[PDB]
Amino acid sequence: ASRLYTLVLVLQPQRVLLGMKKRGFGAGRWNGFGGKVQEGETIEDGARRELQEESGLTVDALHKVGQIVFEFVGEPELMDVHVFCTDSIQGTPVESDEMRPCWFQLDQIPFKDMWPDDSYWFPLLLQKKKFHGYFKFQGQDTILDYTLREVDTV
């Protein structure tokens, strides 16, 4: 009862790229770039595909940074999110009907307008740590419970 997702953070030495979602899942918030993995598709291929579809950017090297399982109470399916990061990209971010990309200085990451779990694992991401996490949500704003631990192997 867990569905595979990817999430890609474009993280450079002094800034991170996030995308403001205009409609649908995550709308109104700054998000990394991700979505469902397709049939016959590897997780890494899915992550590379999602980055392109949502941001316009071509990624060469992707690094595994974490896994986060999300539960929304009253919803049967868990989100099994494989998180990736990259520093080497090609192209420039593309604004679309769906997504408005913007760079943020690391000290100006807009946590108040991001999913609340971000405040927990972004510090790990920013210091190049790998992690396993689990977040139980009620609705989209409230974390009921969570666990988060650093790992050597995602």
Say whether residue 54 binds ligand S3O (CB under 6 A).
Answer: no
Phi, psi of 109 (to 5 degrees): -65, 125
Say whether residue 5 binds ligand S3O (CB under 6 A).
Answer: yes
Residue placing its CB nearer to ligand S3O in the complex, 118 or 131: 118
State whether the Cα torsion 112-114-120-125 is positive or negative: negative
Say whether residue 101 binds ligand S3O (CB under 6 A).
Answer: no
Write the DSSP symbol of residue 150: E
Biggest alpha carbon distance in the chain? Answer: 40
Binding segment (CB under 6 A) for ligand S3O, from list 40-48, 56-64, 86-94, 110-118: 110-118
Say whether residue 56 binds ligand S3O (CB under 6 A).
Answer: no
Say whether residue 131 binds ligand S3O (CB under 6 A).
Answer: no
Provide the token pair at 54. 């949502």
Write the DSSP symbol of residue 108: G
Q: Which of 11, 51, 62, 115 binds ligand S3O (CB under 6 A)?
A: 115
Within residues 19-38, the interface with ligand S3O by CB under 6 A covers 25-26, 31-32, 34-35
Say whether residue 71 binds ligand S3O (CB under 6 A).
Answer: no
- State yes or no: 36 annotated in a binding site: yes
What SS3 state is found at 113? helix
Phi, psi of 114 (to 5 degrees): -130, 165
Q: Please state the closest distance from residue 118 (CB atom) to ligand S3O, in A.
A: 5
Q: Is 15 within 8 Å of 104 (Cβ atoms)?
A: yes
Residue type, 134: Y
| Binding site residue list for 8-oxo-dGMP | 6, 21, 31, 115-118
